[PDB]
């Protein structure tokens, strides 16, 4: 709604800035503290700032909203070197155009949303065993031999019992067929077994474009054409495979494995042959369910029949295939040890296909073009455990990232609470701006700070999150972090972290920029100094902070002494930017009395809870 970026430039950029219509911020070495913080909250929109800051923190101008932008590779702070957020290009300059310069902004700005959220995620890797609202993003990081990942992601294209095609959705360009193959079927899987393998550039494609999950991988290779392959984790058969016997000489059962059964048997007037080797790829998957977590066979649509049988439990068209190619891919799940969940995928059994529904997928999906999306879509079909986080109990730690206040979520708040209230990270959308490429409602804020703070349970803006995170866990979230303090100030995250001891009035908690201007907009509009600070923060709706910690900081920390409590500040390796009971209670008060309904509880239990203590 109302939390702005300063856009800082560097100097050999100022001069453009001028010339805009956002407003200017001339700094000037000295600026106070306390200076920035009232200059700062004169401004409603995102800003742009010049002159020198060479004498301020990293976490100090993060809490501040600062965004670096220059030509130069970064910006001396008094703290680290800073990387820059935001390099402007030489010809941008420079021909001094203010629109191609803002774009440029606005570019690299929409690219920094994912330094936000995978700082997040990784404090989640770190600390938790499910994810929920999961997609691809998840997927590609996590260890599947001990996260859980579970969501609810848009399914693709498929085939059974039952058909439904379409929809059709538009699409884009992606690898070839055959490694674009292995890019959605290759994740949990330690041993795989691939059938009709050919030449291995496939696979060595795959290892040059994925070397992580194939050097995971245990690669038996099987035909009479394959070459040598030095990499040691490719054992080459050059055997020609009929029954399950050639597969089984070639496995530990001593020891447990996931293993994943990949079949692309062809062969060089008809091909009722071609026919006979699908349904081998098939019938010698479904022999050896048991020690298969899974199987995917190649499956070349006949041209005389016009219906007929075969062992599935999806069929679906293949990414970067041609658009006359009329092959799909069959997926089968199989009973054998696997790191998924994936009994929800009906077990592979005897299928029935109309010729003519299958003609049409590839006419729908198949093309050069195509399959960036479906190849996507494939992936998290096959490989998340499909779950409802709000309606899932769980035994193990938890993260539910970005997927709360998703638009199918909407008038659920209370479960949606009940899940940041256990949660080991959670994130809810909080920004009123309005508010584009995110299709979120957003929870209010004043709202959330009531409900969500608890002893064990941290309740901050995005921004704050993440500068309470450079503080705790420095390598986790490094100092150095691109990312946009603005964009993470759209979000609540809540964080399964104790409150700080000492207490200490740490950037994390304590920013309010801007507070000086709500004041006086509360009470042009809708009328009624530390009790007044708590009715205008809650009042505003424009901040999300820890009650708790809040409260234990006013309290417990601060009378005390100005010299033995700064001291317990440095120590805390902890910085700011500003220099009883009843006060907080009459606060309370007045804002459940202004209103109630719409709240509070809660309120209530902060008030029973003040007078206590
Ligand atoms: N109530 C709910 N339960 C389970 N999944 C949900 C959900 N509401 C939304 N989702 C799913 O969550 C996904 C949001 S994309 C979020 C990605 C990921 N959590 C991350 O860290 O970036 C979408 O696939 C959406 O379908
Ligand atoms: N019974 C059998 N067992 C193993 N491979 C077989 C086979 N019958 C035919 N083949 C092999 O199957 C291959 C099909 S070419 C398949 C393409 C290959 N997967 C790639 O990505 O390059 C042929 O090279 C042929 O040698
Ligand atoms: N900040 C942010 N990061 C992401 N990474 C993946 N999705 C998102 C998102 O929606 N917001
Ligand atoms: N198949 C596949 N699709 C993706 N889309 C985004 N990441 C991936 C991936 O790792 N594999």
């Given at each position: 709604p109302e939390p702005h970026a300063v856009l800082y430039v560097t100097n050999e950029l100022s001069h453009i800035v001028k010339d805009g219509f956002l407003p200017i911020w001339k700094l000037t070495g000295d600026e106070s503290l306390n200076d920035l913080w009232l200059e700062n909250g004169k401004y409603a929109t995102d800003v742009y700032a010049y002159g020198d800051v060479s004498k301020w923190t990293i976490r100090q101008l993060r809490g501040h909203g600062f965004i670096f932008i220059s030509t130069h590779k970064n910006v001396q702070l008094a703290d680290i070197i800073k990387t820059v957020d935001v390099r402007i290009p030489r010809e941008v300059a420079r021909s001094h155009d203010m629109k191609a310069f803002e774009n440029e902004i606005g570019r690299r700005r929409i690219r920094m949303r994912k330094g936000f959220g995978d700082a997040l995620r990784n404090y989640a890797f770190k600390m938790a065993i499910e994810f929920h609202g999961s997609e691809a993003e998840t997927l590609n990081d996590a260890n599947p031999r001990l996260h859980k990942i579970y969501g609810m992601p848009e399914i693709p294209p498929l085939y059974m019992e039952y058909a439904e095609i379409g929809t059709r959705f538009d699409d884009e360009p992606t690898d070839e067929k055959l490694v674009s193959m292995l890019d959605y079927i290759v994740y949990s899987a330690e041993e795989v077994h691939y059938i009709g393998c050919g030449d291995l550039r496939t696979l060595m494609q795959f290892k040059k474009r994925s070397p992580g999950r194939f050097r995971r991988v245990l690669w038996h290779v099987y035909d009479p054409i394959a070459p040598?392959?030095?990499?040691?984790?490719?054992?080459?058969?050059?055997?020609?495979?009929?029954?399950?016997?050639?597969?089984?000489?070639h496995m530990n059962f001593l020891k447990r494995v996931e293993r994943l059964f990949i079949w692309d048997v062809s062969s060089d007037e008809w091909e009722t042959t071609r026919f006979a080797e699908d349904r081998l790829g098939e019938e010698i998957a479904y022999e050896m369910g048991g020690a298969f977590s899974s199987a995917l066979i190649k499956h070349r649509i006949p041209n005389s029949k016009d219906e007929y049988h075969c062992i599935s439990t999806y069929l679906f068209p293949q990414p970067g295939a041609d658009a006359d190619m009329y092959e799909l891919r069959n997926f089968m799940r199989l009973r054998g040890y696997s790191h998924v969940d994936r009994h929800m995928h009906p077990d592979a059994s005897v299928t029935k296909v109309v010729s003519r529904d299958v003609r049409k997928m590839v006419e729908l999906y198949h093309g050069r073009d195509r399959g960036r999306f479906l190849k996507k879509r494939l992936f998290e079909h096959l490989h998340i455990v499909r779950k409802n986080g709000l309606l899932h109990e769980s035994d193990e730690p938890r993260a539910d990232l970005f997927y709360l206040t998703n638009r199918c979520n909407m008038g659920l708040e209370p479960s949606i609470y009940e899940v940041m209230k256990k949660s080991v990270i959670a994130t809810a959308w909080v920004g009123r701006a309005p508010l584009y490429d995110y299709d979120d409602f957003a929870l209010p804020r004043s709202t959330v700070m009531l409900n969500g703070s608890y002893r064990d349970i941290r309740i901050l803006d995005g921004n704050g999150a993440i500068l309470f995170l450079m503080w705790r866990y420095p390598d986790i979230v490094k100092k150095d972090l691109t990312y946009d303090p603005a964009w993470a100030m759209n979000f609540a995250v809540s964080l399964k972290e104790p409150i700080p001891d000492p207490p200490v009035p740490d950037i994390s908690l304590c920013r309010f920029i801007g507070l000086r201007v709500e004041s006086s907009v509360l009470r042009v509009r809708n009328p009624?100094?530390?009790?007044?600070?708590?009715?205008?923060?809650?009042?505003?709706?424009?901040?999300?902070?820890?009650?708790?910690?809040?409260?234990?900081?006013?309290?417990?920390?601060?009378?005390?002494?100005?010299?033995?409590?700064?001291?317990?500040?440095?120590?805390?390796?902890?910085?700011?930017?500003?220099?009883?009971?009843n006060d907080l209670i009459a606060a309370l008060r007045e804002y459940k009395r202004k209103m109630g309904m719409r709240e509070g509880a809660s309120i209530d239990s902060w008030l029973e809870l003040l007078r206590h203590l």
């Open positions: 040598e392959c030095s990499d040691p984790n490719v054992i080459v058969h050059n055997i020609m495979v009929d029954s399950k016997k050639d597969i089984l000489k009624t100094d530390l009790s007044g600070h708590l009715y205008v923060t809650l009042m505003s709706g424009a901040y999300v902070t820890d009650l708790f910690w809040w409260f234990k900081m006013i309290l417990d920390w601060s009378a005390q002494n100005r010299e033995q409590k700064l001291r317990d500040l440095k120590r805390s390796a902890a910085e700011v930017i500003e220099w009883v009971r």
